[PDB]
Amino acid sequence: SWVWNQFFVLEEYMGSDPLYVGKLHSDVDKGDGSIKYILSGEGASSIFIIDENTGDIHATKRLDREEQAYYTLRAQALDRLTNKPVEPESEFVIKIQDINDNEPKFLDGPYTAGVPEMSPVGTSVVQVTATDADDPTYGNSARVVYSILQGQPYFSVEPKTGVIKTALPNMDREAKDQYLLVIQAKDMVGQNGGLSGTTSVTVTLTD
Amino acid sequence: SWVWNQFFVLEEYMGSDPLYVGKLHSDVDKGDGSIKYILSGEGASSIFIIDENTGDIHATKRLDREEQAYYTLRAQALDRLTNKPVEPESEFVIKIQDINDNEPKFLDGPYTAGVPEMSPVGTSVVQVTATDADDPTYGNSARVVYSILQGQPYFSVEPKTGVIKTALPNMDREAKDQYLLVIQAKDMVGQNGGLSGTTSVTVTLTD
Ligand SMILES: [Ca+2]
Ligand SMILES: [Ca+2]
Ligand SMILES: [Ca+2]
Ligand SMILES: [Ca+2]
Ligand SMILES: [Ca+2]
Ligand SMILES: [Ca+2]
């Protein structure tokens, strides 16, 4: 079945005029005001208000998707005289639409890892993980690309997975036993304008 | 029935970023990308574009409610592999929301009229009419109030109907047999921020 019972409103609005969310409407409504539209549920009468005559919903404050990403409300349509329902009460969702306002963050960083000296090229060393609190299903605001800022050509990193691998054969611990890498994670899939985060990786060569 | 299959776009958007309209979704969609969402109908694949994977719809150009107020489209959900439907098609509407961007106009102006001299106060002279291309069905963007800018105290105008009337008694043709009035029509029922238009009325005193 098609799912239609959802509205959205953009997060982090800084204007003074309340944002318009949408309109509750019964097709029984003849435009004569005899139906009263009533809002209940999450944020109802506080964050979200309704005009009982027109069904228009507004949001009354700046909203943060990363605080709560959506709200589940209920809609009623009552006859003004009798207060009896003209429609069955229905749930509906108000979705908080994402903007890219969070940087990728390496929450478990910094990293340390060991790898045997003289490992073959392509040996996995460690997987680093940047988390991006934005919406991974809308645009690229939470779609991250990994890169090595400092550490090429000795190591490589898989751009989508954050797995660091050895890149040079025949590393000698006697010559150099430790490497200090800087890894970047950048959203908007690394495109210009993306937000970024970084972490350090200390790689020790083990015998 | 509750009406949930209606999206909205505010007219006359001048930003470079395409305006987000909303999201199509079938509850057959398991989030694995096996469904393709497609649009057809008014504005499809030109004015309105869709991300086939996510169902997200954007508007690609500035729209004018006074050019077209509504777009009726069809949603389909297709199997990505076979291109065959996994839902019955469903109609939906994109409503273009009004802004007050048209001023009242006296398209049949200016006016000429006669009224007998020595008439009772409140004698009808002529009815002027301003039209306003904005949306009359809600709000005051096309609801006008009439006023006389030049021509008081000799004449008055009914603020809602535009009927111009004599205001002074014992008007004497021999003393003065022609008056030139300037009439204003202002939308937002004459409130501050309303747009305005004017016309003139040449009134002759008769027997
Ligand atoms: Ca936020
Ligand atoms: Ca982000
Ligand atoms: Ca966000
Ligand atoms: Ca317009
Ligand atoms: Ca207007
Ligand atoms: Ca308009």
Side-chain angles (χ1 to χ4, degrees):
Chain A
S1 303
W2 293 102
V3 181
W4 295 109
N5 58 329
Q6 176 166 308
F7 299 116
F8 61 91
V9 59
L10 199 69
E11 65 163 334
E12 306 297 1
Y13 171 69
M14 286 190 264
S16 56
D17 284 330
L19 291 183
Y20 180 72
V21 178
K23 183 172 172 84
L24 297 187
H25 187 70
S26 166
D27 63 2
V28 175
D29 191 335
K30 300 158 276 130
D32 66 351
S34 61
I35 293 170
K36 195 166 68 197
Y37 293 101
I38 295 163
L39 199 47
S40 61
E42 297 176 347
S45 297
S46 55
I47 297 175
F48 306 113
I49 61 173
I50 194 168
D51 184 307
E52 71 175 47
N53 179 289
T54 68
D56 290 335
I57 303 174
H58 289 83
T60 67
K61 76 175 190 185
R62 179 178 175 170
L63 294 172
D64 183 10
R65 191 200 83 83
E66 283 80 43
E67 173 50 30
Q68 181 166 354
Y70 66 91
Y71 296 76
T72 305
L73 292 91
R74 295 179 309 276
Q76 294 173 98
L78 306 184
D79 179 78
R80 277 195 209 266
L81 178 59
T82 74
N83 214 53
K84 297 299 198 171
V86 309
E87 297 291 348
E89 174 182 279
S90 173
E91 285 201 343
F92 73 99
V93 166
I94 296 174
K95 170 178 183 176
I96 308 310
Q97 201 66 28
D98 193 46
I99 72 173
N100 187 19
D101 59 339
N102 290 270
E103 300 175 7
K105 295 176 182 175
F106 292 92
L107 304 178
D108 300 319
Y111 291 81
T112 60
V115 62
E117 71 168 325
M118 315 288 183
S119 294
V121 172
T123 295
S124 291
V125 181
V126 65
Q127 179 166 15
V128 298
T129 306
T131 45
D132 188 310
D134 298 314
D135 188 349
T137 80
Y138 186 60
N140 294 305
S141 304
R143 290 180 49 161
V144 171
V145 167
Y146 293 96
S147 59
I148 296 167
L149 297 189
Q150 301 182 252
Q152 298 193 13
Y154 305 97
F155 296 85
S156 64
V157 67
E158 297 196 309
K160 293 303 198 170
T161 75
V163 177
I164 297 166
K165 293 168 182 172
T166 66
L168 293 193
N170 313 123
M171 308 181 113
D172 173 24
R173 323 156 64 237
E174 179 55 40
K176 181 164 169 53
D177 65 341
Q178 210 168 246
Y179 290 80
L180 177 49
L181 317 181
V182 180
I183 309 303
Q184 182 184 92
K186 185 171 192 183
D187 64 28
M188 302 296 292
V189 290
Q191 296 169 11
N192 189 28
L195 307 176
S196 43
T198 64
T199 190
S200 302
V201 183
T202 301
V203 184
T204 307
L205 298 188
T206 67
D207 46 273
Chain B
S1 301
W2 292 108
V3 178
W4 303 113
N5 65 329
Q6 298 210 342
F7 298 115
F8 60 89
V9 175
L10 188 63
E11 73 162 328
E12 308 291 3
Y13 168 73
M14 302 172 44
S16 59
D17 281 347
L19 279 180
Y20 184 61
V21 173
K23 184 174 166 80
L24 300 184
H25 187 72
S26 160
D27 67 10
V28 179
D29 188 343
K30 308 165 219 314
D32 66 351
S34 68
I35 283 180
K36 203 157 68 159
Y37 295 98
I38 300 90
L39 299 178
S40 63
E42 296 180 330
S45 301
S46 54
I47 293 176
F48 305 112
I49 59 163
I50 192 165
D51 181 313
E52 298 203 326
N53 300 315
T54 67
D56 288 314
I57 297 170
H58 293 79
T60 67
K61 74 175 219 186
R62 177 174 174 172
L63 299 171
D64 177 12
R65 195 201 69 81
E66 285 75 46
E67 187 191 344
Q68 181 165 351
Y70 296 91
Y71 296 77
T72 300
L73 290 94
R74 293 285 173 77
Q76 298 183 260
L78 302 185
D79 181 83
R80 190 163 69 179
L81 258 191
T82 66
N83 254 2
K84 295 176 172 151
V86 306
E87 292 275 1
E89 63 182 328
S90 178
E91 174 188 301
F92 70 96
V93 171
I94 299 173
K95 173 177 174 60
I96 307 308
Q97 296 177 318
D98 197 43
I99 71 178
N100 188 21
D101 57 342
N102 289 266
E103 65 190 41
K105 292 176 184 168
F106 288 96
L107 301 169
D108 296 328
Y111 295 80
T112 63
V115 62
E117 60 163 349
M118 303 292 291
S119 281
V121 175
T123 294
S124 295
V125 176
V126 65
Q127 182 168 21
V128 300
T129 301
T131 53
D132 189 310
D134 293 313
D135 199 333
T137 64
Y138 11 71
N140 294 328
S141 292
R143 289 198 191 275
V144 305
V145 170
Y146 299 94
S147 61
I148 296 180
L149 298 188
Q150 288 185 78
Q152 305 178 15
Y154 308 99
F155 296 86
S156 67
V157 66
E158 196 289 339
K160 183 179 172 67
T161 65
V163 175
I164 295 167
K165 299 179 179 176
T166 62
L168 282 172
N170 308 319
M171 310 187 94
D172 187 343
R173 181 183 162 185
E174 286 187 348
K176 178 180 167 72
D177 74 344
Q178 189 182 286
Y179 292 80
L180 176 54
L181 318 180
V182 179
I183 311 301
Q184 174 182 101
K186 185 166 191 172
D187 62 29
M188 308 294 298
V189 287
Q191 295 160 11
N192 312 80
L195 297 176
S196 290
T198 58
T199 192
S200 74
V201 182
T202 302
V203 182
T204 297
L205 299 193
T206 68
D207 291 353

PDB file of all heavy atoms in Angstrom, chain A residues 72-93:
ATOM      1  N   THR A  72       4.988  11.191  16.156  1.00  0.00           N
ATOM      2  CA  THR A  72       3.762  10.470  15.810  1.00  0.00           C
ATOM      3  C   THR A  72       2.574  11.139  16.481  1.00  0.00           C
ATOM      4  O   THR A  72       2.488  11.193  17.715  1.00  0.00           O
ATOM      5  CB  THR A  72       3.818   9.008  16.220  1.00  0.00           C
ATOM      6  OG1 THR A  72       4.989   8.403  15.643  1.00  0.00           O
ATOM      7  CG2 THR A  72       2.560   8.276  15.752  1.00  0.00           C
ATOM      8  N   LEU A  73       1.686  11.665  15.644  1.00  0.00           N
ATOM      9  CA  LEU A  73       0.494  12.366  16.091  1.00  0.00           C
ATOM     10  C   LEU A  73      -0.766  11.641  15.664  1.00  0.00           C
ATOM     11  O   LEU A  73      -0.711  10.657  14.927  1.00  0.00           O
ATOM     12  CB  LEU A  73       0.499  13.788  15.548  1.00  0.00           C
ATOM     13  CG  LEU A  73       1.598  14.665  16.146  1.00  0.00           C
ATOM     14  CD1 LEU A  73       2.890  14.628  15.353  1.00  0.00           C
ATOM     15  CD2 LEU A  73       1.175  16.059  16.287  1.00  0.00           C
ATOM     16  N   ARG A  74      -1.902  12.119  16.174  1.00  0.00           N
ATOM     17  CA  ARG A  74      -3.206  11.610  15.781  1.00  0.00           C
ATOM     18  C   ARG A  74      -4.073  12.782  15.341  1.00  0.00           C
ATOM     19  O   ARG A  74      -3.984  13.883  15.887  1.00  0.00           O
ATOM     20  CB  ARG A  74      -3.856  10.815  16.927  1.00  0.00           C
ATOM     21  CG  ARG A  74      -3.073   9.542  17.282  1.00  0.00           C
ATOM     22  CD  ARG A  74      -3.703   8.765  18.450  1.00  0.00           C
ATOM     23  NE  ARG A  74      -3.975   9.614  19.610  1.00  0.00           N
ATOM     24  CZ  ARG A  74      -3.083   9.924  20.552  1.00  0.00           C
ATOM     25  NH1 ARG A  74      -1.842   9.455  20.487  1.00  0.00           N
ATOM     26  NH2 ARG A  74      -3.435  10.711  21.568  1.00  0.00           N
ATOM     27  N   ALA A  75      -4.867  12.530  14.306  1.00  0.00           N
ATOM     28  CA  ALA A  75      -5.760  13.486  13.695  1.00  0.00           C
ATOM     29  C   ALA A  75      -7.185  13.062  13.974  1.00  0.00           C
ATOM     30  O   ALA A  75      -7.530  11.886  13.776  1.00  0.00           O
ATOM     31  CB  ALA A  75      -5.526  13.538  12.193  1.00  0.00           C
ATOM     32  N   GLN A  76      -8.003  14.024  14.383  1.00  0.00           N
ATOM     33  CA  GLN A  76      -9.444  13.825  14.498  1.00  0.00           C
ATOM     34  C   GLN A  76     -10.164  14.895  13.721  1.00  0.00           C
ATOM     35  O   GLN A  76      -9.689  16.023  13.610  1.00  0.00           O
ATOM     36  CB  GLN A  76      -9.910  13.868  15.947  1.00  0.00           C
ATOM     37  CG  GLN A  76      -9.395  12.729  16.777  1.00  0.00           C
ATOM     38  CD  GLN A  76      -9.737  12.904  18.240  1.00  0.00           C
ATOM     39  OE1 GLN A  76     -10.715  12.339  18.734  1.00  0.00           O
ATOM     40  NE2 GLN A  76      -8.948  13.703  18.936  1.00  0.00           N
ATOM     41  N   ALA A  77     -11.327  14.501  13.217  1.00  0.00           N
ATOM     42  CA  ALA A  77     -12.232  15.388  12.515  1.00  0.00           C
ATOM     43  C   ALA A  77     -13.603  15.217  13.153  1.00  0.00           C
ATOM     44  O   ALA A  77     -14.239  14.187  12.972  1.00  0.00           O
ATOM     45  CB  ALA A  77     -12.266  15.054  11.050  1.00  0.00           C
ATOM     46  N   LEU A  78     -14.029  16.202  13.935  1.00  0.00           N
ATOM     47  CA  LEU A  78     -15.279  16.098  14.691  1.00  0.00           C
ATOM     48  C   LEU A  78     -16.329  17.094  14.186  1.00  0.00           C
ATOM     49  O   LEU A  78     -16.020  18.228  13.865  1.00  0.00           O
ATOM     50  CB  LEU A  78     -15.030  16.339  16.178  1.00  0.00           C
ATOM     51  CG  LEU A  78     -13.968  15.488  16.887  1.00  0.00           C
ATOM     52  CD1 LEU A  78     -13.955  15.840  18.368  1.00  0.00           C
ATOM     53  CD2 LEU A  78     -14.184  13.980  16.681  1.00  0.00           C
ATOM     54  N   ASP A  79     -17.573  16.637  14.090  1.00  0.00           N
ATOM     55  CA  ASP A  79     -18.705  17.527  13.812  1.00  0.00           C
ATOM     56  C   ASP A  79     -18.841  18.559  14.935  1.00  0.00           C
ATOM     57  O   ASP A  79     -18.890  18.202  16.106  1.00  0.00           O
ATOM     58  CB  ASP A  79     -19.986  16.714  13.671  1.00  0.00           C
ATOM     59  CG  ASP A  79     -21.184  17.577  13.403  1.00  0.00           C
ATOM     60  OD1 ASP A  79     -21.337  18.009  12.245  1.00  0.00           O
ATOM     61  OD2 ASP A  79     -21.960  17.823  14.351  1.00  0.00           O
ATOM     62  N   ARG A  80     -18.894  19.845  14.592  1.00  0.00           N
ATOM     63  CA  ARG A  80     -18.888  20.894  15.610  1.00  0.00           C
ATOM     64  C   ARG A  80     -20.096  20.847  16.536  1.00  0.00           C
ATOM     65  O   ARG A  80     -19.976  21.110  17.734  1.00  0.00           O
ATOM     66  CB  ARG A  80     -18.803  22.274  14.970  1.00  0.00           C
ATOM     67  CG  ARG A  80     -17.397  22.641  14.646  1.00  0.00           C
ATOM     68  CD  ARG A  80     -17.209  24.108  14.355  1.00  0.00           C
ATOM     69  NE  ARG A  80     -16.089  24.206  13.442  1.00  0.00           N
ATOM     70  CZ  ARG A  80     -14.823  24.415  13.784  1.00  0.00           C
ATOM     71  NH1 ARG A  80     -14.461  24.627  15.048  1.00  0.00           N
ATOM     72  NH2 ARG A  80     -13.919  24.430  12.825  1.00  0.00           N
ATOM     73  N   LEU A  81     -21.256  20.516  15.992  1.00  0.00           N
ATOM     74  CA  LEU A  81     -22.453  20.470  16.809  1.00  0.00           C
ATOM     75  C   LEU A  81     -22.414  19.302  17.794  1.00  0.00           C
ATOM     76  O   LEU A  81     -22.517  19.494  19.005  1.00  0.00           O
ATOM     77  CB  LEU A  81     -23.689  20.364  15.925  1.00  0.00           C
ATOM     78  CG  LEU A  81     -24.998  20.267  16.709  1.00  0.00           C
ATOM     79  CD1 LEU A  81     -25.163  21.490  17.608  1.00  0.00           C
ATOM     80  CD2 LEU A  81     -26.178  20.108  15.763  1.00  0.00           C
ATOM     81  N   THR A  82     -22.248  18.094  17.264  1.00  0.00           N
ATOM     82  CA  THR A  82     -22.407  16.876  18.049  1.00  0.00           C
ATOM     83  C   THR A  82     -21.114  16.424  18.709  1.00  0.00           C
ATOM     84  O   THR A  82     -21.138  15.672  19.682  1.00  0.00           O
ATOM     85  CB  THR A  82     -22.922  15.742  17.176  1.00  0.00           C
ATOM     86  OG1 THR A  82     -21.866  15.285  16.322  1.00  0.00           O
ATOM     87  CG2 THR A  82     -24.099  16.212  16.320  1.00  0.00           C
ATOM     88  N   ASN A  83     -19.990  16.886  18.176  1.00  0.00           N
ATOM     89  CA  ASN A  83     -18.675  16.440  18.625  1.00  0.00           C
ATOM     90  C   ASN A  83     -18.422  14.968  18.252  1.00  0.00           C
ATOM     91  O   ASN A  83     -17.483  14.347  18.747  1.00  0.00           O
ATOM     92  CB  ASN A  83     -18.525  16.647  20.134  1.00  0.00           C
ATOM     93  CG  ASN A  83     -17.105  17.006  20.536  1.00  0.00           C
ATOM     94  OD1 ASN A  83     -16.513  17.949  20.002  1.00  0.00           O
ATOM     95  ND2 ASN A  83     -16.545  16.247  21.477  1.00  0.00           N
ATOM     96  N   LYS A  84     -19.248  14.428  17.362  1.00  0.00           N
ATOM     97  CA  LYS A  84     -19.062  13.055  16.857  1.00  0.00           C
ATOM     98  C   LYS A  84     -18.071  13.017  15.692  1.00  0.00           C
ATOM     99  O   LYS A  84     -18.025  13.948  14.894  1.00  0.00           O
ATOM    100  CB  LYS A  84     -20.391  12.469  16.393  1.00  0.00           C
ATOM    101  CG  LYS A  84     -21.434  12.314  17.502  1.00  0.00           C
ATOM    102  CD  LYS A  84     -20.959  11.379  18.607  1.00  0.00           C
ATOM    103  CE  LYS A  84     -22.131  10.876  19.449  1.00  0.00           C
ATOM    104  NZ  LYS A  84     -21.730   9.804  20.403  1.00  0.00           N
ATOM    105  N   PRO A  85     -17.299  11.928  15.563  1.00  0.00           N
ATOM    106  CA  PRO A  85     -16.319  11.915  14.467  1.00  0.00           C
ATOM    107  C   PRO A  85     -16.940  11.800  13.068  1.00  0.00           C
ATOM    108  O   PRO A  85     -17.855  11.003  12.870  1.00  0.00           O
ATOM    109  CB  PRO A  85     -15.456  10.686  14.788  1.00  0.00           C
ATOM    110  CG  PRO A  85     -16.350   9.790  15.621  1.00  0.00           C
ATOM    111  CD  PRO A  85     -17.212  10.732  16.420  1.00  0.00           C
ATOM    112  N   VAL A  86     -16.449  12.598  12.117  1.00  0.00           N
ATOM    113  CA  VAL A  86     -16.814  12.464  10.715  1.00  0.00           C
ATOM    114  C   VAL A  86     -15.828  11.554   9.978  1.00  0.00           C
ATOM    115  O   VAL A  86     -16.130  11.050   8.898  1.00  0.00           O
ATOM    116  CB  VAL A  86     -16.873  13.834   9.999  1.00  0.00           C
ATOM    117  CG1 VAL A  86     -17.735  14.795  10.785  1.00  0.00           C
ATOM    118  CG2 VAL A  86     -15.501  14.423   9.807  1.00  0.00           C
ATOM    119  N   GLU A  87     -14.636  11.404  10.553  1.00  0.00           N
ATOM    120  CA  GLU A  87     -13.623  10.461  10.085  1.00  0.00           C
ATOM    121  C   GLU A  87     -13.149   9.626  11.261  1.00  0.00           C
ATOM    122  O   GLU A  87     -13.140  10.112  12.388  1.00  0.00           O
ATOM    123  CB  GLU A  87     -12.387  11.155   9.501  1.00  0.00           C
ATOM    124  CG  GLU A  87     -12.614  11.996   8.276  1.00  0.00           C
ATOM    125  CD  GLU A  87     -12.948  11.170   7.071  1.00  0.00           C
ATOM    126  OE1 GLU A  87     -12.774   9.930   7.146  1.00  0.00           O
ATOM    127  OE2 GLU A  87     -13.386  11.762   6.042  1.00  0.00           O
ATOM    128  N   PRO A  88     -12.710   8.391  10.993  1.00  0.00           N
ATOM    129  CA  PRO A  88     -12.019   7.659  12.053  1.00  0.00           C
ATOM    130  C   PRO A  88     -10.699   8.326  12.388  1.00  0.00           C
ATOM    131  O   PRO A  88      -9.982   8.739  11.469  1.00  0.00           O
ATOM    132  CB  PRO A  88     -11.799   6.269  11.450  1.00  0.00           C
ATOM    133  CG  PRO A  88     -11.852   6.481   9.954  1.00  0.00           C
ATOM    134  CD  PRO A  88     -12.830   7.612   9.751  1.00  0.00           C
ATOM    135  N   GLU A  89     -10.402   8.447  13.674  1.00  0.00           N
ATOM    136  CA  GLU A  89      -9.133   8.995  14.108  1.00  0.00           C
ATOM    137  C   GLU A  89      -8.002   8.237  13.453  1.00  0.00           C
ATOM    138  O   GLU A  89      -8.045   7.009  13.331  1.00  0.00           O
ATOM    139  CB  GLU A  89      -9.009   8.934  15.625  1.00  0.00           C
ATOM    140  CG  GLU A  89      -7.663   9.355  16.161  1.00  0.00           C
ATOM    141  CD  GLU A  89      -7.581   9.224  17.658  1.00  0.00           C
ATOM    142  OE1 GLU A  89      -8.074  10.121  18.356  1.00  0.00           O
ATOM    143  OE2 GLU A  89      -7.005   8.226  18.135  1.00  0.00           O
ATOM    144  N   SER A  90      -6.995   8.982  13.013  1.00  0.00           N
ATOM    145  CA  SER A  90      -5.873   8.376  12.315  1.00  0.00           C
ATOM    146  C   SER A  90      -4.545   8.875  12.836  1.00  0.00           C
ATOM    147  O   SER A  90      -4.378  10.049  13.114  1.00  0.00           O
ATOM    148  CB  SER A  90      -5.966   8.663  10.820  1.00  0.00           C
ATOM    149  OG  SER A  90      -4.805   8.216  10.128  1.00  0.00           O
ATOM    150  N   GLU A  91      -3.584   7.965  12.943  1.00  0.00           N
ATOM    151  CA  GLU A  91      -2.210   8.363  13.187  1.00  0.00           C
ATOM    152  C   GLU A  91      -1.644   9.054  11.954  1.00  0.00           C
ATOM    153  O   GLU A  91      -2.090   8.813  10.815  1.00  0.00           O
ATOM    154  CB  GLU A  91      -1.340   7.148  13.538  1.00  0.00           C
ATOM    155  CG  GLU A  91      -1.566   6.632  14.947  1.00  0.00           C
ATOM    156  CD  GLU A  91      -0.406   5.803  15.448  1.00  0.00           C
ATOM    157  OE1 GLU A  91       0.418   5.363  14.624  1.00  0.00           O
ATOM    158  OE2 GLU A  91      -0.307   5.628  16.673  1.00  0.00           O
ATOM    159  N   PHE A  92      -0.657   9.914  12.186  1.00  0.00           N
ATOM    160  CA  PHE A  92       0.156  10.445  11.096  1.00  0.00           C
ATOM    161  C   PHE A  92       1.488  10.881  11.667  1.00  0.00           C
ATOM    162  O   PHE A  92       1.624  11.018  12.875  1.00  0.00           O
ATOM    163  CB  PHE A  92      -0.562  11.579  10.361  1.00  0.00           C
ATOM    164  CG  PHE A  92      -0.642  12.865  11.113  1.00  0.00           C
ATOM    165  CD1 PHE A  92       0.248  13.888  10.857  1.00  0.00           C
ATOM    166  CD2 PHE A  92      -1.646  13.088  12.047  1.00  0.00           C
ATOM    167  CE1 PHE A  92       0.145  15.094  11.521  1.00  0.00           C
ATOM    168  CE2 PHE A  92      -1.729  14.290  12.708  1.00  0.00           C
ATOM    169  CZ  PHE A  92      -0.835  15.285  12.434  1.00  0.00           C
ATOM    170  N   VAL A  93       2.485  11.058  10.803  1.00  0.00           N
ATOM    171  CA  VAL A  93       3.850  11.365  11.256  1.00  0.00           C
ATOM    172  C   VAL A  93       4.263  12.737  10.780  1.00  0.00           C
ATOM    173  O   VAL A  93       3.925  13.128   9.661  1.00  0.00           O
ATOM    174  CB  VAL A  93       4.843  10.308  10.753  1.00  0.00           C
ATOM    175  CG1 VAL A  93       6.310  10.778  10.912  1.00  0.00           C
ATOM    176  CG2 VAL A  93       4.616   9.015  11.497  1.00  0.00           C
TER     177      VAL A  93
END
